[PDB]
Amino acid sequence: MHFNELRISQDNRFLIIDVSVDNQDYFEDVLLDSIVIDTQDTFVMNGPSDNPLYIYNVEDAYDTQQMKNVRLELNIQDLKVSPCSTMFFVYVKSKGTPSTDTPCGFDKDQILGTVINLQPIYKQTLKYLKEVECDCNIPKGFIDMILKLKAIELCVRTGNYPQAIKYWNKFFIK
Amino acid sequence: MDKMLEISEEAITRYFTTLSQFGYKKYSDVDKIIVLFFMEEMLAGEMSYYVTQDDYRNIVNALYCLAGSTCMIDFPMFESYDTLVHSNNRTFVPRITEDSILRSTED
Amino acid sequence: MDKMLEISEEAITRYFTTLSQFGYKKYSDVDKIIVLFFMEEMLAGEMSYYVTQDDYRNIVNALYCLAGSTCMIDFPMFESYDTLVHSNNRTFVPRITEDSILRSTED
């Protein structure tokens, strides 16, 4: 099970989630179960936390192949969070048993995808480039921002979300 | 957890490997080893019933201070398939060059 | 008691072993040896009949200041099977999935 697109809308008003189940033959029995949204405040390592930001159960929408693909567009202001200074964690679940021929390690019910707003980062890069235009010297804040973004990338791809939030809160919010 | 076990075993094995090669490890790092294995036995014992999720948050965010502190303790690696910017593999398929009253359309 | 005798025998044997290998033991340690065997003599004679339980408590707590004080006097080891955190080997045996009016129920 995987993500098709997991993006925040360019208008900074919707959080786009478009999930799908993998096309391989032995997820025929497997479906999509729920969508749980967490922020940098309510995250826990062991799956979604209690009192989450927004829970979604997918039988509610439909009345079986329609249930294998889902698309959500959440008005972020309705979630009562800041679209610019929020890092969303999007969990998904399966509620379904694959066949007995699955190769090992592929049978995992849950996934996760981190989300942030790239507009503030784009504005910071534009500001630093404007500074570079004057006298052709590289500000050190620009290199610091680049390397800290790469640090958060490494933390996310290695799954070390606690230190990822620590860096986010320490550098890209305050 | 089953992972605090692995980190603690790795840390103390590295500690005794250093004491085999050298004859000295900084006690400022022996303190970190002590904290680490004390926490793991705390969480894998009869005192794991007194922890809320806020306590879990605090414990994890305090243990991550020990992650890259010394060579004995390392940043754990989890199975992750995410990133800060994701790829858009959606495909475009309009219907016989049609549009809605305002915009485009697809299958 | 039967254990003060063993502790004292070990202590003076170690004392004379050191005086065999060396020719010197700290007299600040000979003082502890003297206290130890004086107490051993007093408790194992006609003077023990004046001992109350408060006196026994005070005597034991004063003797344990000698425990790890020197190499001659050593911490005694007793037969114990306890700990500060005991194990939970109770088993759960539900009956006919039967909840009680409020609590769950077992055999």
Binding site: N46 | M1, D2, Y49, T52, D55 | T97, D99, S104
Partner: peptide
């Protein structure tokens, strides 16, 4: 794997609901 208090509360409440 690891449990917190709240996890046990959910489990026991869900047991009692269906008994």
């Amino acid at each position: 794997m690891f449990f917190t208090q709240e996890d046990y509360r959910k489990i026991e409440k869900w047991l009692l609901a269906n008994s």
